[PDB]
Amino acid sequence: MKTEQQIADIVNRTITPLMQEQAIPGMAVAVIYQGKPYYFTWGKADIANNHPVTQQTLFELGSVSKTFNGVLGGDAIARGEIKLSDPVTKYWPELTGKQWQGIRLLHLATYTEGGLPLKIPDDVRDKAALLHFYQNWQPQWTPGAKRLYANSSIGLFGALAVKPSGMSYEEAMTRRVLQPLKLAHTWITVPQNEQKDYAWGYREGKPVHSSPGQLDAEAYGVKSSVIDMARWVQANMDASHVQEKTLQQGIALAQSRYWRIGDMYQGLGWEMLNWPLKADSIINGSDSKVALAALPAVEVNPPAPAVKASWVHKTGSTGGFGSYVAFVPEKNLGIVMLANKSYPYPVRVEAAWRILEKLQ
């Protein structure tokens, strides 16, 4: 097995040119290797004010937030509070249009509802406007026909999934996921006494933070540190240490296979491919030209239970940040890459692959 110095050499050999070539001000990486997390930090969380990246720096996860959504939903399934087969109208009866009649929670959770838009429109800023938007949306195809990635589908799934609990989404996420997993540096809303650790994102050489929007927490609005993200990857890779039974089962359910889209399988938030695999499949699959395309979907019903021989991963971005998380349960190997600049998805995936390939 490799020493810490050997792992550091491997990580730095990839990250050093990456940050220079992509003009990334700050990064934090965790490698999970033979059961242990190894942490690395470089650069600046705030350039003008000279604040370094540390193991406590908070990064905007962007759509990596959907992995938290999927686990919270899995926990609700395990609690018996919801079933993915339930109609959306069980939880939002005011969606009375015929286009909602056959849409199930399953479809919202997995981008298979019929073609909701990538984001809720900017001018939808209250509950009345949100209802109007969904009521008047018209699908492009029947439920299950295609997978088309969106924030507005899984975002609504998260809002509906927590209804039986009587809690807000943020309250339920905190009580049911973050607190049991001891994720004390993971936030939907960063409190004032933690703002000192909230990195600035950089877009076109200017510091930026993400703007709020409807159903943001549910789809793209989580912030977290490298320590918490490593602990999150560890718990998702192997939840045998998680003593809360419904949370352990909910983690497993987010890695069930619900749909087959070529060689990719859709979990709850997490996306999976069989392992072993060819690097080009994930690198090319991460390009927006594939990842954002509407592709035919094949249902896996009942969902296939998690298998160890899988590459489990999720990309995410905001205006100023780019993140990537991936793990292989069979190998007990994983990686977290957090950066305060958005940079191309295939570059993220290739760098992660290069590191993990040397740690086989």
Numbering used by the authors: 2 to 361
Task: Give sentences copied directly from the paper behind this entry.
CMY-185 is a CMY-2-like β-lactamase and was identified in an Escherichia coli clinical strain isolated from a patient who underwent treatment with ceftazidime-avibactam. CMY-185, possessing four amino acid substitutions of A114E, Q120K, V211S, and N346Y relative to CMY-2, confers high-level ceftazidime-avibactam resistance, and accumulation of the substitutions incrementally enhances the level of resistance to this agent. The other substituted residues E114 and K120 incrementally contribute to rejection of avibactam inhibition, while S211 stimulates the turnover rate of the oxyimino-cephalosporin hydrolysis.
Structural comparison with these enzymes showed that the CMY-185 free-form structure is quite similar to the structure of CMY-2 and CMY-136 with the root-mean-square deviation (RMSD) values of 0.45 and 0.52 Å, respectively. The substituted residues K120, S211, and Y346 in CMY-185 are located adjacent to the substrate binding site. The residues S211 and Y346 form hydrogen bonds with residues E61 and S318, respectively, while the side chain of K120 is exposed to the bulk solvent. The substituted residue E114 is located at the inner molecule, and it forms hydrogen bonds with the main chain nitrogen atoms of G116 and L117.
